[PDB]
Structures are given as C-alpha cells and as structure tokens.
Design a protein around this ligand. Structure first.
Ligand SMILES: [Mg+2]
Ligand SMILES: [Zn+2]
Ligand SMILES: [Zn+2]
Ligand SMILES: [Zn+2]
Ligand SMILES: [Zn+2]
Ligand SMILES: [Zn+2]
Lengths: 200, 185
C-alpha cells in the first residue's frame, strides 16, 4: 500500500471499519473476512501479521493472538472504489476455529482441487506402502516414478495425435498425478514450477 | 440452504450481508458487494449475482448497467454466518482489486494467453509436433529427476507444463477439464 493509496481509503463510507478479505497467497482459497480500522491496518503493515479491529472486545487483535494461527502478510490491495481491502497471506496453521483451512467450509473454486491433490500426495510421502498407491510409488524409488512420468507423457502425446479427446483427458490426468508425485519425491512442488513459468 | 438462510445472521450485519465474489474456476477474487435478504433471494432464483446498493440506490443485478453479469455457481456462509462467499462465472470483464493475484492464478492466466496465441506470428506445426514436445519433455523430466538435478528438473517440469497446456488447447481441451477429471477420481 502506497501512502496515497492509504490516503484514498474511504473510511467515511465504511464508518471507520474497513472490510478485509484474506486470501491464501498461493492457492487462492478465501480464508476469512474481517474488519480493520486505521490503526489495525497500520499494525498489519508494520508487523507483517494480519491485525483486525474487534468491535466485540473493542480492541486490536492480531489474528492468532489466542490460537497460534497467524496470517503472514504477502500483499494488500484496495478495490476500485477504495472501501474493501484484499490481503494475500500465508497461514501459519489453520485459519478457522473448526480445525479447517477456511472459514467458508467446503466451497472451493475448481482449481483449488489441484492444490489439494498435491497436498494429499505430499502428506503420503514417508507414510508406508499400503496406505495408498502414492506411498507405494514413493517406496519404488525415484527411477520408477520417473518411469511413469515418461510413460504417461508418451500416452498423452499419442492420444492427442490420434485426436481421442477422452483418452487425452485421462492420460493428461495420469501425467499430472505422477508429475506431482515426482516433484514431491525430489523436494519440489508445482508452486515452484508455476513460479519458474512466471519468471518466463 | 434452507437452514443456511434461516441461520444467516441478518441482525448482526444490520440487514446488509458482506458478499465476496470469487471466480468459480480460477479463484481470483473479483469484488465485494452487499446483499439484503431480497438481494440474496433474487440471486438464488435468477442465478445472477444481485446486490443491494449500500449508498441508497435500491436492488441492482450486477451487470444491469454494463452487460457484465455474474452467473452463480455456489454460495456459502462463513462460520459465524455474517459473510457469504459466492463462486460465480463472469460473462463480461477483470478483478476490482487490480494486479494482485495468488500465485497459482498465473497458471490459469498462462493458459488464457496461450489460447490467445493461436493467432500470432508450435500451433501451426500440427498436433504431432506439440505431442512430440510433450513426449520429449516427459523423457527429460524423468531423466533430470532420476539424476537428482532439481534445477534442471524445475526447468523441465516447467517446459512440460507449458507444452501440455499448448497440446490440450490444440485438442479443444484445457487444464480445467483435466483438474475436474482428477477430481471425479
Ligand atoms: Mg524441456
Ligand atoms: Zn468497493
Ligand atoms: Zn472460522
Ligand atoms: Zn495413463
Ligand atoms: Zn467462527
Ligand atoms: Zn464472519
């Protein structure tokens, strides 16, 4: 937030309490909505931790003050008419008091599933070979996982070349699953790949 | 939903519920508006996002000025029932929040741009040439992982994703269709 951006925030239209959307800075999941006054926004900038004004306790509260689940600020932006902020943040622990990542429960944009799939495949690392197909892959060693990425790339190429769109959909799915596993096996992740793509 | 609307905390929000609109596919936050109970009713029945103007100016279907409507996919309350999250599909341009975007949004945008570059100065070389790039970079990804060169593996996985998007677009598919396919398994 530039100084002039903060000058243009419409506190009078919001009656000194600005609605603030907190979104996961990587996955795009909407985590919560809270409210800020000028001092909450200022403490948010200075500390790097999302800080709200609690009308209940009529005090500032850094989200995580009593839970341990903080939101590390990555970015802050106003909307087109300056009466709502979007904070992109990294949660250190789950955001909702129900033990789950979002205060909005189980409604999620389509692409979130890919991120959740990766998360699941990254938990199954180092968690014994009949828990899942994934764990047994992990146990097979890097060479066998890479072998499946290679095979699935071949199947994807061939199904496209034959113009069998339904087979291309399924082999592309296989490719993605095994690529996720292979990246996890090498201490990487799709986020790293997307970043590398972004730089180019 | 029945119970969910029974349980919305209309009194806490002085009759006006904050409403986050988020792209149903990509996750981009598009806007924040406000809804009174009739605005939410009209939104549910019409399938188009309908707000109540906070200044004074009546009900208002998003797009009744511009042609840019939002088609409802999903509506959820947060945990203390004083904010709604609406997932919707826009029909007309993109976010009221400027350039800010979560990291994975870039993948979605890359796909879009790749579609827009069917008409530039790979695509022209046929399905076979793209499929060749996919197969070769699968090989290179497998080899780089196998020798534990994480930098090369990052670059090769990146090539592989980019060309996979090109191939899907070439066969009138996209990564959203693949993500949904993985979902149903
Ligand atoms: Mg390559
Ligand atoms: Zn606004
Ligand atoms: Zn919550
Ligand atoms: Zn396959
Ligand atoms: Zn709660
Ligand atoms: Zn709430």
């Amino acid at each position: 937030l530039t100084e002039q951006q903060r000058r243009e925030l419409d506190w009078e239209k919001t009656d000194g309490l600005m609605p603030v959307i907190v979104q996961h800075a990587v996955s795009g999941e909407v985590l919560m909505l809270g409210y800020m006054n000028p001092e909450a926004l200022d403490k948010t900038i200075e500390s790097g931790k999302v800080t709200f004004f609690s009308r209940t306790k009529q005090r500032l509260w850094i989200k995580g003050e009593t839970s341990g689940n903080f939101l590390n600020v990555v970015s802050i932006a106003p909307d087109c008419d300056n009466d709502t902020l979007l904070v992109l943040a990294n949660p250190i622990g789950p955001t909702c008091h129900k033990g789950t990542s979002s205060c909005f429960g189980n409604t999620a944009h389509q692409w979130l599933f890919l991120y959740q799939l990766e998360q699941l495949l990254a938990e199954r690392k180092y968690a014994d070979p009949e828990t899942s197909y994934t764990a047994k892959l992990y146990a097979s060693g890097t060479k066998r996982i890479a072998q499946k990425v290679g095979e699935e790339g071949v199947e994807t190429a061939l199904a496209a070349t034959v113009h069998d769109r339904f087979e291309l959909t399924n082999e592309a799915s296989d490719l993605m699953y095994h690529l996720l596993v292979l990246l996890q096996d090498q201490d990487l992740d799709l986020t790293t790949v997307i970043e590398n793509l972004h730089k180019r």
